Each structure stands twice: as C-alpha cells, then as structure tokens.
Design a protein around this ligand. Structure first.
Ligand SMILES: [Mg+2]
Ligand SMILES: [Mg+2]
Ligand SMILES: [Mg+2]
Ligand SMILES: [Mg+2]
Ligand SMILES: [Mg+2]
Ligand SMILES: [Mg+2]
Ligand SMILES: [Mg+2]
Ligand SMILES: [Mg+2]
Ligand SMILES: [Mg+2]
Ligand SMILES: [Mg+2]
Lengths: 125, 52, 53, 147, 56, 128, 187, 53
RNA sequence: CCCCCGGAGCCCCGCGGACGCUACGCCGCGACGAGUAGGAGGGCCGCUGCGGUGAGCCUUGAAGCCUAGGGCGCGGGCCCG
RNA sequence: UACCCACCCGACCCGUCUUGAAACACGGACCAAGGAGUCUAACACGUGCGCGAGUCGGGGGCUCGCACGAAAGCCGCCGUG
RNA sequence: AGAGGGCGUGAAACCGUUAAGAGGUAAACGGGUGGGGUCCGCGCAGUCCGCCCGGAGGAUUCAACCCGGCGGCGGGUCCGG
C-alpha cells in the first residue's frame, strides 16, 4: 500500500537530498521534487510525470498504467507532445482531469510543463 | 513457511501476523462507513481580531 | 581485549528480519528507493530458469 | 553507545554533574557494603530488615537432588495430556478416566489448586495433597501412588 | 491593605473599564470582548446577553 | 536585472553584529566562537551592565525571512548538474550555489544549464 | 511581573508513540483522525492507549476475557484490547468471542477460531464500529508485574509488608535483626 | 493472510516461459524496517576482531 | 413542473479536493520566558571510522593553510570569493 | 556585519574554594599539539522489540579453504539447564 | 627551487620591513553613530518582470470538425472466462 511505503521512504531513500535547511527528492517523474506523499513517484500507484523530450523540443508525459504494477518494464507508459505551448498545456490538462487520474498533480503538472518550455527557446542577450 | 501451514524445514516457525491488514488508510478514510459518522469539519481559520 | 565485542539476537527476531527483508525485495518502490536501477526489469519478483545453476 | 551518553552533554560544564561544593572524591561512604552496623544502619535496617545475624539450623553438605520435588496444580492437569484424550472422554459412555502419569511430565507431586473439570481421571504421582485428593475423588476418580 | 488601593467606583468608571480594557475568560483564554456573541456564548445561561447586560 | 524573486519583503535583523567570546580579545588562545561563560564570579554570565551580550533565543530572525539572502532566495548547494533540476520548480523562491570544489570545466556546464531554465546562481561568474 | 509557579505547568503525557514500528504509527494515523472528529470518547481512549508502553498496556489472558464477557448484558458485543490476548491453559469451555487486539498469541488464536469466533484488528474495528458502538474495552492487570511488589512503604517499617530485593531467598538470607522478635526486634 | 498472485518464470534469454509459480506467502510478510535495522546492527557487530592496546 | 453542478458558477458546495498534506507536516488562538549546584530535551552543532547510498566531487587542482573578499544561522558553526 | 580612526554613555581580570573575590586570597608570560566520567561484571527501575505460561541461550553439534566468515544458517539439540 | 641537501604542506606565538590611520589619563572592551579606507555589487537608466487584453505591423500551419490507426482512463452488464 502507498501509506506503507511512505513510512519506509520518508527518510532513508536514495533519492532524498537534505542540505541547506531544505529537503528534496530527485526521484523520477515527481513534480517539483518535493519529498512528499502527494508528490512522489514510486510510492503511489497512479503517477503523472512531465520531463523534457530527449530531442530538445517538446514535452513527454509519463503515466503509470496501474494495470499491473511490480512490472516496472511496462508498468509505466510515456507519450510525446510537441505543440504550441497552449495546446501543450491543454493536453496535460485534459489528460489529467476528465480522466480522473490523480487530480492533485493537475496544476503542478502544468506549472512543470510551462517551466519546461520556457527552458527551450532563445536563452539570453 | 506459509501462513496456514508450518515451515516443515524449520522446527517450529510460521510467518508473523499483522498488527493491521489494510495497510492503506486512504481507502479506509473515504469509505462510506467512516465518512457517514463524522462531525463536519471546521476550516474558517480565525485570524485574531484587533481590538478597537 | 575483553570488551563485549559480539552481540545477540533472539532466534525468531532474526528470522522475522528476513521476512521483512524479502517482502520488501518485491514492491519496486522500496527496491528502486535503494537505488537499484530497476527501470527495465520485466517483473520485480524476478524468477529465472534453473539453467542458470 | 558513547553517542547517547550524558557525559557528552556535560562538556563545558565544569563540575561534570557532581557538584562543586562536595566534589566527586574517591570513596566517601566506604567500600562496598561496609558499615551496616555503623553509619549505614538506617539503610540496612529500613530496606533490608533481617540482614544481620544467625538463624535456624546448619545442614552441612546439602544436596538438592535429595529433596527434588516439582509440583502440579489441578489447575493444569489436562494440559500435560493432549487435549484430544480429554475430548475422547466426557463421552465414550464407559467411564474411561484416562491415566495421567505426572511422573512422565516431570512432577513428583500434585497439589490441589483450582477447579477441576467434571471428568473421571486416574492420576499417577508420587506425593499428593489432601485437598488434591478430595478434588479428584469428589469429581469421581482415583489417586494412584508410584514409587 | 499595604499592597492595594480600593474604593467605590461610579458608573462611568465601570463603563471605561469594561469597554476599553475588558477581556473575557473563555476556554481559559484572555480573549478580547470585541463582539457580544462572546458574552452570550459564556453567560447566556444567566440572562446576560450583551456588553451592556454585563454592566448591570 | 536577473531573476527577480517571487516576494521581496523587508528583511529586519534584530542584531547584526557577531557574538564574540568573553576575553577573546585579550588572549590569542581564545577564538571568537561563542562559549557560554560558566564562572561563579564571572561578570558576563550574570548579565551585568555594559558587558558583551549573551545570545539567547528571543534574539532570532523572523520566521518568514529566515535563512534568506539579501536578494531574496535561499541558497541551495548544487553539487553537479543533475542536482540542478531539483530546483526547476522551487526557483522563484530560492536559487543555486555551486560547490567550492567543482572543477572549472563542468563549473561552466552548471552555469548555462541554469540560465536555460532561469535558476539564478549566486556565484555564476566564478572560476573562468 | 507575574507570580505563578512554573513548576508543573508543562503536562507530562505521551502525545505520540515513542516506538518506531510503522504499523503502530499507521493506525495511530487512523485514530489521530477519528479521535478529533467523531463524538465517541471510545477512540479517544483507544488513541490514548496506542501511545502507551508495553509495561503499561499489559497482556489480557483469555480467561479474564471470558468472565468479563460472561456478565449479564454484554453478550453480542466485541472485546477490544489495546494489547495482546494470551492463552489460559487453565480454562477449557471457550465461548464464541469477537475480539480485537494488536497481537494475539498463536495458541490463543486457534482456541478462538475453533470455537466459531472471529478476531479483528484495529483497522477492521474502525470499519465495524467507527464510533465504537457495541464494544467492551478491557485491559490486563497493570498492577500485575512482579515489580509492583517491591513498591510501597518499605520492608522493615511497621506492618507494611513489601518484598525486599534479595540475591536469593533462603534460610540465612534476611531472617535476623528486624524479622524474628528473638533476634533484636521485628516489624 | 493476503491474496497471492502468480509470478512468471522467465527463460534464460529474456521472454516469458510458460511456467508460473505463485507468490510464496513470505512476500506478504510485514515489512518492518525498525526490526531489519535493529537486527542488522546487532549482527554486523559479530564479524569483528578485538582491537586493544 | 418546482428538472441535470462534466456544470450552481461558486462566501458553501455534503459529487472531487489546498498551494498547504515531509500527518513525527502545516495552521489558529491564548498565556508566559531571572538563574548557580543539578536534571531533562533538542541540536541539516562539530571530530574520526565502518555498513549503506549520493550514475557525488577531484591534475580544467582534493585535504590542509591563508585571506580590510559576499553572506546564512539566536549559536555550535556553516556556506561561498 | 567585519579593517583603521573618532566621539558620548557604560565598563575592575579571568578560573576557583567561598556567607562574601576587582581583591593586600591562590593558579595563569605567550603560542602550538597532547589532556580527564572509561570498559567489564552485578543488580535496580524506565524505555524499545520478539515470543508469550512460557521463553531463551550457552556450551556443544551439523554446514569451509572465510574473500566477504573467524559471519550467516540449521539441530527430538530447546531444556540437560 | 614561492621543492636547494634537516629541502612536501608550511599554521600561531614572535620578529622584520612596506602601506594606512591614530596617539598627555596603560591598554583592551560593550552600546550607539560618524569619518576614512580596502574591496564588493553596480549603472555609462536598474527602470525589475510575468499574464491576460486592445491596437498596429510581419510570418508559418493548425487547432474547432470529421475519417484511419495506435495507446490509455474510467464504467458498468460481473456479460463471458
Ligand atoms: Mg548548569
Ligand atoms: Mg571541582
Ligand atoms: Mg530561562
Ligand atoms: Mg581528513
Ligand atoms: Mg573565610
Ligand atoms: Mg584587601
Ligand atoms: Mg589553596
Ligand atoms: Mg614544494
Ligand atoms: Mg618548505
Ligand atoms: Mg606609518
């Protein structure tokens, strides 16, 4: 169960990083790196992830399938979206909500999408 | 050993029992049995009033 | 030299330390959370043929 | 561990938990239990009443095996036997009264504590109590002696 | 007597104290008497319902 | 004009001076690090008049602006690159600080990857 | 310039289990919820017990659990013990019971099931009767530990019988000045 | 006493052989890190030589 | 008739829940804060070593040392130039 | 904030024993490194964990040349005690 | 060789000289500012940005809609297994 793991992983995790009076979690496909319960990648059984596409342009959307877990090879499906930063946002919007798929990440997923695109465009003067 | 059978390779030993079965409480806390018997919440955080 | 170097455990205690050790070898959350790079493994209670012996 | 020891938290504390008026000198009271009569009397007399002095009768070269005698109460007699021999009774319509060899389970004596189930028995032991006699008799059953 | 200074207060003295410096003990707290639903909430079982009923 | 903070309050600091140890001036054997004096007749530990001040708790910083740099961001000791994308979200509140003993080559690679996703770095023009 | 004694203003009671066992920390997360919400003082006692120490929530024998359930009226209810159910070899007529406990020793587990009974845990009890409706709270005797015998006035003060700590009891071990009237005195 | 699924055996070269065992009840045992940790520390002390002066 | 939130449009929403929810987290109220001897608690205070772990750091310069260099913590100390 | 300087107010040198120390009481020129509540046994209570009228643990035994092992595992030995 | 034969690193006390500032109540110190410095951040306007909108310019392809395919989610008939 999720609440079980979280009691093994609250401290004592290979993705937990505690320094400089903050704490953080570098685990895959958790939004905003929060060492948390809501915002955790492994503990749960329905998780939404958003990371840049490996090409340099786009946004890939990890969704855990929940069909069968303890199947890490396939338990875990991705997809790509290369669009115009307004449909891009409204794709993760319609994908999380009106799917009733963890509508906790619903906003944190978008603010991570937007902040991904801001990172792939002309950098500075 | 399994649960309802001895070890049969160790002398006398069986798996430990559980202090609780449904180790998840997210489902327990929003089942209709529990939800029905609850005092309604109190979430109107009362900032202290300045006395004029 | 006669510092009490060695320690003790009850028999059942150090047996039931193996149950929880094994039961957590399933549950990929706990496994990966030890940084064991299981992202492509087909299934977590990974069983192999007995050719390997 | 040394880590969770109050001696860590006593760093920079001058007297080290022992008070600067009367320091931690070596041996202020005495050494060991010394002064039971003198100046430690209030302790020995109010916490260990009966310490000082002889009593009784000497029995030189005592050996425990001579006077070895464990005890059962009737409380737990049907525990020495597998409970099915009790269930294969209160039944069977013959007055079976299975035999309980208290000697085999390691007890040279049966004492009369507790209730006894309304059930015929034969109890083989070495030494019986009187009330343990009456509790078995009155339930219907025999007391058989063994050497 | 060498520690205190007491005397017989008049009405205006009662008002001044109760309004400006009047706090009510509710749940063992010094809570300011800002509205009289706090006075009735404690004293309503005695016909006292408002800031003015306290002063009676 | 780099990377404004989310909220830039008024930072007030009840005492800005250090807390030197009693007699850390007369003797060199004594560092400026605070040690709570424990003399019987010691005149600081009994908080006498016009003597050096003993640090206590009610002397401490505001809960909102605590650990806050003068710009607004809390530091994060970023050690390599992958430990930067931790801050990808918590970026307008606090920033990145590159570790001292990072080689000069990847000390660059950390800099412009941050300027990509707008993570202000406090020591960005450092080794060169 | 206030004049209260701050001697005992801080109240010393446990507000969290001093233990680390995640399971006890989990159903504490459950009755940290029920206790605040439902009007039932029931779980407020169940919660205030899940904090306490092993030495303070003693085991309940199985027979002491019968004679507390045999009383007229409490038939049909569930026994609820924040503790363990042990076995009692000196009891045989096991009526059918509905028990809840943190632990139940394996032997007492089979005496109960064989008698057509049922055992729950403190999370199914939360789904059975979240208000604690139709329950019986019990405990073992907290003045049961052999430690409680060495407590009291003192051994050797007048007619206050309290067991003294003796390395090994026997003839020549503390029957002397203070015990027999013949040798000094006695109390 | 939970429900126990069917763990598939993999052939020596990846893909899934027809054989299918069960999850042995050990893997439903209670995880308890408080006991794993405790038993671990009191056992790792034993493989250790006396150092003295 | 007096109807449906996949929509009443929301100051109450009981159909789904914070950014907030590290549930040993976060939050709102009050009260109070002298201290030797002494006790207790907390110390992402510090030192050396081991089992883990950081796809950690490192000849594009580690430890140490030095610094009227920028700062954080009530402070132990710490981070940077 | 920290370097130097200036000023107004404050301000006696620390450690210690002591009813009382700035004392015409004693230790102390200065700076580095070293330096003091330890281990064992035996009780006692508190606390955590396993099992529970039982529960062990030792010595033995069965399994290795240890790499990790002089570990881990197992034994009507588990009750001789 | 700012590793030169007791030569890695090279601290403090202490001393040498250069620079800067001071100087009749021994120095040192706490609070408060002021003056000067060494640097540090800047600016050769720091006017900080981020939405939404309105307007005027310029450019590529779609969203809305259907049709083919893939992949999920949830649902119930527990329908079939
Ligand atoms: Mg003290
Ligand atoms: Mg002394
Ligand atoms: Mg105080
Ligand atoms: Mg070192
Ligand atoms: Mg004198
Ligand atoms: Mg004099
Ligand atoms: Mg002297
Ligand atoms: Mg050299
Ligand atoms: Mg040299
Ligand atoms: Mg000069």
């Amino acid at each position: 169960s999720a609440h079980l793991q979280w009691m093994v992983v609250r401290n004592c995790s290979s993705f937990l990083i505690k320094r400089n009076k903050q704490t953080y979690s570098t685990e895959p496909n958790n939004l905003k790196a929060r060492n948390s319960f809501r915002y955790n990648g492994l503990i749960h059984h329905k998780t939404v992830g958003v990371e840049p596409a490996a090409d340099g342009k786009g946004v890939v959307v990890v969704i855990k399938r929940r069909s069968g877990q303890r199947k890490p090879a396939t338990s875990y499906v991705r997809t790509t979206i290369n669009k115009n930063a307004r449909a891009t946002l409204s794709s993760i919007r319609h994908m999380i909500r009106k799917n009733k798929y963890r509508p906790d990440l619903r906003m944190a997923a978008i603010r991570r999408a937007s902040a991904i695109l801001r990172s792939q465009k002309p950098v500075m003067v | 050993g399994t649960w309802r059978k001895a070890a049969t390779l160790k002398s006398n030993y069986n798996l430990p029992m559980h202090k609780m079965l449904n180790t998840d409480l997210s489902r327990i806390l929003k089942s209709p049995e529990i939800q029905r018997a609850l005092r309604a919440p109190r979430k109107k955080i009362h900032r202290r009033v300045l006395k004029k | 030299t006669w510092r009490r170097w060695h320690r003790r455990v009850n028999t059942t205690q150090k047996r039931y330390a193996i149950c929880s050790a094994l039961a957590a070898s399933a549950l990929p959350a706990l496994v990966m959370s030890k940084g064991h790079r299981i992202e492509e493994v087909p299934e977590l209670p990974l069983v192999v043929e007995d050719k390997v012996e | 561990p040394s880590r969770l020891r109050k001696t860590r938290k006593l760093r920079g504390h001058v007297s080290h938990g022992h008070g600067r008026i009367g320091k931690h000198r070596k041996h202020p009271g005495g050494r060991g239990n010394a002064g039971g009569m003198h100046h430690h009397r209030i302790n020995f007399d109010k916490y260990h009443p009966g310490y000082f002095g002889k009593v009784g009768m000497r029995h030189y070269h005592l050996k425990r095996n001579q006077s070895f005698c464990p005890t059962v109460n009737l409380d737990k007699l049907w525990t020495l036997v597998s409970e099915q021999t009790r269930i294969n009774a209160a039944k069977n319509k013959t007055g079976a009264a299975p035999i309980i060899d208290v000697v085999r389970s390691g007890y040279y004596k049966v004492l009369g504590k507790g209730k006894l189930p309304k059930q015929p028995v034969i109890v083989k032991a070495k030494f019986f109590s009187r009330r343990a006699e009456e509790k078995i008799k009155g339930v219907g059953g025999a007391c058989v002696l063994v050497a | 007597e060498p520690y205190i200074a007491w005397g017989y207060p008049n009405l205006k003295s009662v008002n001044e104290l109760i309004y400006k410096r009047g706090y009510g003990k509710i749940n063992k707290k010094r809570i300011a008497l800002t509205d009289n639903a706090l006075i009735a909430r404690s004293l309503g079982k005695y016909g006292i319902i408002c800031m003015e009923d306290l002063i009676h | 004009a780099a990377l404004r903070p989310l909220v830039k309050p008024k930072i007030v600091k009840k005492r800005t001076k250090k807390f030197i140890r009693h007699q850390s001036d007369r003797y060199v054997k004594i560092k400026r690090n605070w040690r709570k004096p424990r003399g019987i007749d010691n005149r600081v530990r009994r908080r006498f008049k016009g003597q050096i001040l003993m640090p206590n708790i009610g002397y401490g910083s505001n809960k909102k602006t605590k650990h806050m740099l003068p710009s607004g961001f809390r530091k994060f000791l970023v050690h390599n690159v992958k430990e930067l994308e931790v801050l990808l979200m918590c970026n307008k509140s606090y920033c990145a600080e590159i570790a001292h003993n990072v080689s000069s080559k990847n000390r660059k690679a950390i800099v412009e990857r941050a300027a990509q996703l707008a993570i202000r770095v406090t020591n960005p023009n450092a080794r060169l | 310039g206030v004049d209260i004694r701050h001697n005992k203003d801080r109240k010393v009671r446990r507000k969290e289990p001093k233990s680390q066992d995640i399971y006890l920390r989990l159903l504490v997360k459950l009755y940290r919820f029920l206790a605040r919400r439902t009007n039932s003082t029931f779980n407020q006692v169940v919660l205030k017990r899940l904090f306490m120490s092993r030495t303070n929530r003693p085991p309940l024998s199985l027979s002491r659990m019968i004679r507390k359930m045999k009383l007229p009226g409490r038939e049909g209810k569930t026994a609820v013990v924040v503790g363990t159910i042990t076995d009692d070899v000196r009891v045989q007529e096991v009526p059918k019971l509905k028990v809840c406990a943190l632990r139940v020793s394996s032997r007492a587990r089979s005496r109960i099931l064989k008698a057509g009974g049922k055992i729950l845990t403190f999370d199914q009890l939360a789904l059975d009767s979240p208000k604690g409706c139709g329950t019986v709270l019990l405990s073992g005797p907290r003045k049961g530990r052999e430690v409680y015998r060495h407590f009291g006035k003192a051994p050797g003060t007048p007619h206050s019988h309290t067991k003294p700590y003796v390395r090994s009891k026997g003839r020549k071990f503390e029957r002397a000045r203070g015990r027999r009237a013949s040798r000094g005195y006695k109390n | 006493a939970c429900a126990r699924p069917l763990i598939s055996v993999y052939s020596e070269k990846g893909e899934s052989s027809g054989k299918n065992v069960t999850l042995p009840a050990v893997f439903k045992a209670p995880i308890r890190p408080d006991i794993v940790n405790f038993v671990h520390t009191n056992l790792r002390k034993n493989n250790r030589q006396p150092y003295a002066v």
